[PDB]
From a paper:
The C2 domain packs closely on top of the Notch-binding DSL domain without altering the structure of the DSL-EGF1-3 portion of the construct in comparison with our earlier structure for this region in isolation, and therefore extends the near-linear domain organization (Cordle et al., 2008a). Many missense mutations that affect this domain of J-1 cause Alagille syndrome, a developmental disorder that is usually associated with J-1 haploinsufficiency, and mapping these mutations onto our structure suggests that they destabilize the hydrophobic core and prevent correct folding of the C2 domain (Penton et al., 2012). Sequence alignments with other Notch ligands suggest that the C2 domain is present in all mammalian Notch ligands, with conserved residues mapping to those that play key structural roles, and residues exposed on the surface of the domain being more variable. Since the strongest structural homology of the J-1 C2 domain is to calcium-dependent phospholipid-binding domains (e.g., the Munc13-1 C2b domain; Shin et al., 2010), we investigated whether J-1N-EGF3 binds Ca2+. We first used a limited proteolysis assay, which showed that Ca2+ (but not Mg2+ or EDTA) protects the J-1N-EGF3 fragment (but not a J-1 fragment lacking the C2 domain) from tryptic digestion. This suggests the presence of previously unrecognized Ca2+-binding sites, occupancy of which increases the degree of structure in the C2 domain.
Numbering used by the authors: 32 to 55, 66 to 142, 148 to 337
Write the structure that this text describes.
Amino acid sequence: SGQFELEILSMQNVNGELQNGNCCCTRDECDTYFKVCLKEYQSRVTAGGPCSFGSGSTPVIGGNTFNLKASRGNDRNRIVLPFSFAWPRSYTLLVEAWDSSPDSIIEKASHSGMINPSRQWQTLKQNTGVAHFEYQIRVTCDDYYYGFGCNKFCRPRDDFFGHYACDQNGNKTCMEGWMGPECNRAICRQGCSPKHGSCKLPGDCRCQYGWQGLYCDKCIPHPGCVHGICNEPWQCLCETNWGGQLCDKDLNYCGTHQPCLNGGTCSNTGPDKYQCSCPEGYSGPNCEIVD
Ligand SMILES: *[C@@H]1O[C@H](CO)[C@@H](O)[C@H](O)[C@H]1NC(C)=O
Ligand SMILES: *[C@@H]1O[C@@H](C)[C@@H](O)[C@@H](O)[C@@H]1O
């Protein structure tokens, strides 16, 4: 989730002394190493206290005086303090220069401040006292982590869980045809019924039971429906001159069949039924008999 990094830049111990006053002076060279303690911001800085955000120490870097400003900074001259919590922005940093081979302090430093995730280094100096030392600090985010606390996670996906890439703010930007916060809801065919149509995959309008068409907006009439319509699934509402549950009964056998012959007037009597009114010199149920 994140790392606080500390790099040693330089040490200047001209006299090759210690914090007490003793020598590690042409007797011997100081075996200079660094101890680091990182905790919560303190308005009134304590010497002790637990190192809540991390503790660490370097192996022997150099002698009495060394300059690493033009050098790279490797596993030996730097300390990495990782963190899984949200970066609180504010911190209290304790950096100490120590001599190896009983161990005793050379110079002690403390710094209370505020820092945001950034690859850019912040140089800090210990100018007071006999021994002078420089160092640089920074807080960087781990891969897929965003925000001021290096706590916002975003990894691009094109699978079961989502189809998106990540913003500069670690916000999900949906792939074409996807929507929602997790970018896992497919965008249906343009015109697809909001009531009876649904997705699974982009531009694929799947019909609700009893609905049909390219847009799932047309009801399926009751099976066996002839001369009837529907507004709802399984309906079979008859058109003019049609009757019955399935709209199969002809209520206008007259306008259909035209049974009366030689210009006679036809009248209805219900399901497939008629009546003929015959002209001059005509007889029969269908006015077929002349005279
Ligand atoms: C975009 O990122 C900002 C900052 O993290 C957040 O407050 C906002 O809710 C995000 N927008 C969306 C749509 O997720
Ligand atoms: C209906 O009745 C028959 C007898 C004819 O006169 C037709 O012209 C009429 O429309």
